[PDB]
Design a protein around this ligand. Structure first.
Ligand SMILES: Nc1ncnc2c1ncn2[C@H]1C[C@H](O)[C@@H](COP(=O)(O)OP(=O)(O)OP(=O)(O)O)O1
Ligand SMILES: Nc1ncnc2c1ncn2[C@H]1C[C@H](O)[C@@H](COP(=O)(O)OP(=O)(O)OP(=O)(O)O)O1
Ligand SMILES: Nc1ncnc2c1ncn2[C@H]1C[C@H](O)[C@@H](COP(=O)(O)OP(=O)(O)OP(=O)(O)O)O1
Ligand SMILES: Nc1ncnc2c1ncn2[C@H]1C[C@H](O)[C@@H](COP(=O)(O)OP(=O)(O)OP(=O)(O)O)O1
Ligand SMILES: [Mg+2]
Ligand SMILES: [Mg+2]
Ligand SMILES: [Mg+2]
Ligand SMILES: [Mg+2]
Lengths: 481, 481, 481, 481
């Protein structure tokens, strides 16, 4: 084996170490070729055909770029080839646990199918990695290239999921703390995963990326902070970091939480729920699993991809009729209809335990308007989206360390007020989207009256088109006009 | 219904007439979301996740751009909204007939599975279109927007496949001949289909596109030629057209005929052949079809997509064991091994009827070299690739008409010698690639000796690495050194 | 004359009407080829070689695109070819009044050379346009293409500079009010001038543009607002518009107000001041003007371009020695040294009449630190930069009208709270940069102590590197640590 | 001093070693900011505002990239930091000798102004470099960073201009021969200068670049050839190299030799000739030089830039009236008129000594057509352009060495027949453009008849529009029809 070159449209010609090639050329990794990065987003942005596979290559490549750059600027860090490979592998492998349609699976489907369980793609990534290594005889190959499986496998997993439980990490000591900031940055979210997806998603979406990660890499240094060696950014680059998060939020607003992309994810989730009892996936020793239980056996999970969607759509089994009909409505574009969007007011905040009760509230609103049809709870979908800068109410730039050019080894902190008054005063918010499952003209007219009445009753913000869609409702509320 | 905007990364925001939206929002069209544009190319160029769906939107959009541009410059043509919609629809629908992995299906699989039949994706596109229209009640909608289904459906089909049988076309008269040059140009190959794929494939492959179709559109005019109204290009743009074909050939060399992408297509084709007797696809009236017979029923063909690959890979049926093993070798990257490439010499040309005999010739070559293993015909794959400028030996620019700025209505012809001495003297060639199905070191060493000996025996060109891979063979041939 | 095609790297092949070509092919327009768009920015961003000429073509092109798009969607507007040409000409010509190094000239040099006068590039553009028309016999040509010079010339000028004095405009009636929003939008700043420069500046700077103007054009409509017909944006696009201004501000922060680009502009301005008494420019009737007086005669102004810089640099006249020495320091990169940046606190705001007093305040600060040198007022430069969303304290989105898809003819308003909590709470701020003209190590050390002491005395924000550059000063201030 | 980062739109963030910064920040280098890369090309392609300065940075950067890549792949080469800096400096400095409007100066102006002398920009680059070093005290700084001025300055100059006189180079021994292939490749033309300009010129022109230099860098290796260590390319990349030269030729055809860009260069050259006796440039010791003699004194040459054009255009001196009038015709776009283009037939080849006689031949042609005006030799311009693959009749790929993957250290040769039949059979040709200085309708009509008659008399190829512009002339020639 010698090193391979891959041509990526985002990053150009990437060199892959033979050990990485060996990890990549497994069923567990190749699986990511059949999982769309953006799930239902492809049904709205037709350029978004890209899959988790190529994103993972890019994350692995950027992880290598950063660790290499730091080692070249600061030989005193003693970054070894072994460290580089471990960081690259963690980069490559942090998406292994994604399910069909990526975030739809762990964001919508598992929560509803297995409410008692707490599962994340991160957990899944660790499990799949363990399975990948064991199933494919990778430990010997790691040894051949100077890695120490006991320590290094632990390191890799900690990079992905954090401490598997003071310095809480075992795979590397505090002297190498900065290595944990590269692939999945638990402190402030600034990691090479974002950098690849910003660039790649934009390339495919037809939206232009505002963040320059190569510049950031050039200005990054390691400095001592509170007895840890941490990655620090040049002080004057602080604006670029606020911009990075602004970019992320804009991508969510325009693409990842697109009102129609979300309703398609919701419809697909509904079909999966209705198919769950009848689709069988063979795991370890020939034992059969369901869509919702494949997460318990990585052999089965390996075979759980976007292909599930087509298996359902092309099924003839009468058991799968209801699931198959939902997917067919997607193909004819007979989708649940968007009614509108609103936000809570003041401090008001909506908890996950209350999500299920919301369609019922909308249906209970009693607008003083003439209605041909009366709508029930089950006719309404209410999608609640938490938007933030990756840390709920917290400002992630308050968790970033900087250095100045006159003292490159001395870490400092920068407050929001030292940067600009034009920055946000809050860093988290909720959006509520309401959809109606009844798509005819009269139902939709009615749904609009309920929705706007409910906004008024709850003292939510005025929907943007409120006066046009519900002119008889909006005048009752002084604050709106 | 009103017009929709779609954001395409190649063309930007494209407007779609509601009738086009109706055609698009059918199972027959949406199917193209699950067929990779470049087939096995994705297994070499990881950016090439793109599917035929989005390419078809682009072709439909460009077809509209060109017909609109001509109408705006020359009102005297009397191009109607009806003409525009018909040309857009033909553009949208000329890829409907592609099968799993696009050109792998009609270029490799069908020729081997059903040797007696002549089938093309073009034929398939017409059949699928008819099925699309009838299955979805589109004729009434066409009438609602001013189309005349009898004439216009005929027109659309002729744009895709040519005369369904002097002026040989029935869907439009000679006065509108130029409309037939837009979507699928049978005279010289210069059409909007190429223009989309150059741009789109380059964007995804990470290769840069050298042809400017927007410029071409600006300089296009309709002029009278031999009692037909034909699209003519500005004389000075002739170099750009030679460049267009040069670009196409370069894309084939670098990407579409990549030696490994082709062997992957070949391996997938082999798996499909071994699965063909056991995979069943439900068509009209519940009747069951095979992969190779789904082309006879469009209802079944609608459900024949790349998903077949994963159906096989994830199968547990022992009948599909051999097919499934081939796909598993792809995932582990245990691929048939490339041995080398060579070309015929002089006038020598290789016909399709002789393809099957070639592995046998390679195995019959008797290199005077010491060999541990002896290889048989079935161990060798010989892939013969015809490279041309789209017209076999013919120069397509000899079939283009031009105009000069001093007389914009007067069509003229341009010879190669009026353009440049730096153009090719021939416009067609064949490449022969040889691969070995036995992948071990000793088999591959042997395969190299056979291959190079066979090249010498047949008086083919010297493989580039011939002296290195077969130093004991190459000296016998004077011409090579 | 017939229409010309120009290839622009930003917009592609642009068609120019022959009348526009005639306006372009004059000394008054061609002059823009020798004025850098970004002035001193080229000395920091080497890709920023671009000149106002090519920007002006782009603004003229986009002005045409928008007016065409509106006319195509709404024939009821009665937009004529005459209206289109007038809007294009205003677009082409709104940059005619720029001086050497663009905003350096009217932002720094004229204010200091002719403090009593109020001049702007806008005024200059009108004057230069009048001169262009009269000097080149353009009125007859305008008549030949259906324009009415009396009304249309007035219209064009009003599009550039606003009312030359209710409906305050004379060139077109209220029915055509929306035409005034295209080239230079006085109501909210959203115009095609921004759109070209975002795209063009980013292309040359090596920074990526976040705003999609083509999308905006597709969703724009004209609706009635307060008895005017105004351009309205689709409601859901409101986020994109906030993003547009965010992008503008980011471009200012990264490029247009780059600390070193600004000091170069300042040094060039200083050289121009020292050269002003000696450089002579011939205007009308052979009369001689100065750099600072060329604005009074358009014949002289025509010959006032970036070339002035080189005329000074290459001069041998001993009178110009001091000016020439400043420019030579630029070439050797011996620039005034950046000391730091800070901002006012709370409501504090700094007026233009106080700018001159600021170096004196810095020099008067008395840091308790050991200093080798003592610095004087004239050793300090204080640059005050007003950053906003184009309307001082005002939110420009409050001055935008929207429409919803259920009632496309009905204009509505959207408040900030209807959009997001993650938007700025303020829309204007000031940055203060301090530089030292003494560049040696000890002077700069001292300058840092004065600067930080002055920030502390004035209760400005703590400079980012304050603790590193002035560790003995920063502890006295509680608020900073 | 520490290393600086510059943001280039083509290459991104480039790091500059402090020694390079010191070389850059001199009047001799900064001069390149005022010399357009493409000369008169900007007057046809408005995006082509770029100057030689930024190109030189890119060449210096790519030179560094390649030498670094080779050192990283092959430590055994013993490439030192000293070698890297020398190669970077040669890259940075190979354009120092360009004059106003780049190739216009040494391609058109000097040959006509000083016919007896042989001068090239290469020679000029060496002289300017020597002047840069000596004028700015760079030798001590070189020593400070480990360079040995005696050997290294010699090396740098040899990289630029070749041997200043068996191994003919003195700055480095044969073991380092491959270092001479990087900045200016005298063996086959494949160097980093091309790579920058392809990318940069395309970015500005609005034409898309077909060559991937990063890929080439990845596949480059050093191998022994004929007792030299040379840079070798991977065998299979041979097609990419043919494509590189094809791209270069296409860029010449579309842009660098654009018929109107060339006539603008020609008109500027004419103005310079008429201004040459009156413009004075101060050189060493206050001595005065002319445009045409500034090449003899680098102090004067330092001040000779594109600014000369504006000095002439803005002059009031009656001596410069004729020169100034030519430039004014450019501004009004009253340009010499293109008549047509033709090529020699067979082996026919046109020598430089015969260029002056050609307008006289055109004027002597006696077309049997009715003419209002009779034209004289001085009314015609004949521009002869030699197009090749950089080596006259020779195929540069015959002078490239390759390696195969089975033996990466073993250099091999590849013939054209081993690559493709679709390649050119010849690698050089001449284009002849004829223009008329009399621009009225009747003169141009006449000029066309003379031109086509002269083509017929000389047995040149038929102009493309010949039948349209000269219908009464073309029938006499059988071969043409
Ligand atoms: N001319 C090209 N330009 C850009 N990318 C290319 C080109 N040819 C191939 N690629 C892409 C496809 C792959 O992603 C990557 C590696 O391809 P390539 O170098 O052909 O690998 P290979 O494995 O076929 O070569 P090798 O024969 O040495 O193993 O580069
Ligand atoms: N709701 C969604 N809809 C569509 N795509 C999504 C959604 N959520 C995430 N994605 C996609 C887009 C991104 O490229 C990618 C981000 O998720 P992932 O790659 O797991 O990193 P992450 O979990 O750290 O995300 P983040 O950057 O938000 O922290 O997944
Ligand atoms: N082959 C090409 N590909 C891309 N852009 C080009 C090409 N040739 C020219 N351009 C650019 C340069 C100009 O901005 C614009 C117009 O060029 P061109 O068509 O040659 O005008 P022209 O005035 O010389 O031709 P004509 O003889 O038609 O008047 O296009
Ligand atoms: N925010 C930015 N984003 C992208 N590129 C930038 C940005 N700021 C500057 N550049 C570019 C322009 C310059 O050519 C190059 C260096 O600029 P910059 O880092 O500001 O150096 P500088 O010398 O002004 O700062 P300092 O000397 O404090 O390090 O990078
Ligand atoms: Mg390989
Ligand atoms: Mg919609
Ligand atoms: Mg022209
Ligand atoms: Mg700096």
């Amino acid at each position: 084996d010698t090193m391979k070159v891959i041509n990526d449209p985002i990053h150009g010609h990437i060199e892959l170490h033979p050990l990485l090639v060996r990890i990549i050329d497994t069923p567990q990794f190749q699986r990511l070729r059949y999982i769309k990065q953006l799930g239902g987003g492809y049904y709205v942005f037709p350029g978004a055909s890209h899959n988790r596979f190529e994103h993972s290559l890019g994350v692995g490549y950027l992880a290598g770029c950063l660790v290499h750059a730091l080692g070249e600027k600061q030989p005193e860090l003693q970054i070894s080839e072994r460290d580089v490979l471990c960081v690259q592998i963690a980069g490559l492998c942090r998406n292994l646990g994604h399910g069909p349609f990526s975030h739809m699976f762990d964001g919508r489907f598992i929560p509803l199918a297995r409410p008692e369980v707490k599962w994340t793609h991160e957990q899944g990534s660790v499990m799949m990695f363990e399975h990948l290594i064991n199933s494919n005889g990778i430990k010997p190959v790691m040894e051949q290239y100077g890695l120490i499986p006991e320590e290094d496998i632990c390191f890799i997993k900690e990079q992905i999921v954090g401490p598997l439980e003071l310095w809480p990490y075992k795979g590397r000591p505090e002297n190498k703390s900065f290595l944990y900031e590269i692939v999945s940055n638990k402190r402030n979210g600034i990691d090479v995963d974002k950098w690849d997806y910003f660039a790649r998603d934009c390339h495919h979406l037809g939206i232009q990326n505002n963040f320059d990660y190569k510049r950031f890499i050039k200005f990054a240094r390691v400095c001592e902070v509170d007895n840890e060696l941490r990655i620090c950014a040049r002080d004057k680059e602080v604006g670029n970091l606020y911009d990075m998060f602004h970019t992320r939020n804009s991508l969510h607003r325009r693409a990842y939480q697109h009102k129609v992309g979300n309703i398609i994810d919701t419809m697909i989730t509904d079909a999966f729920l209705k198919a769950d009892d009848y689709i069988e996936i063979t795991g370890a020793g020939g034992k059969k699993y369901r869509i919702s239980t494949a997460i318990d056996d990585m052999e089965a999970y390996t075979k759980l991809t976007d292909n599930i969607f087509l298996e359902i759509l092309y099924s003839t089994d009468p058991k799968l009729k209801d699931a198959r009909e939902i997917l067919k409505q997607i193909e004819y574009r007979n989708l649940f209809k968007y009614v509108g969007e609103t936000q809570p007011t003041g401090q008001i905040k909506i908890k996950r335990e209350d999500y299920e009760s919301l369609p019922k509230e909308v249906a209970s609103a009693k607008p003083k308007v003439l209605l041909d049809v009366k709508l029930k709870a089950e006719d309404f979908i209410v999608d609640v989206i938490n938007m933030d800068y990756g840390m709920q109410e917290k400002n992630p730039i308050d968790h970033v360390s900087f250095y100045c050019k006159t003292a490159p080894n001395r870490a400092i902190r920068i407050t929001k007020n030292q940067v600009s008054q034009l920055l946000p005063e809050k860093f988290a918010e909720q959006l509520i989207r309401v959809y109606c499952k009844k798509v005819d003209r009269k139902s939709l007219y009615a749904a609009r009256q309920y929705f706007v009445q409910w906004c008024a009753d709850r003292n939510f913000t005025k929907p943007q088109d409120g006066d046009v869609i519900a002119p008889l409702i909006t005048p009752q509320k002084k604050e709106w006009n």
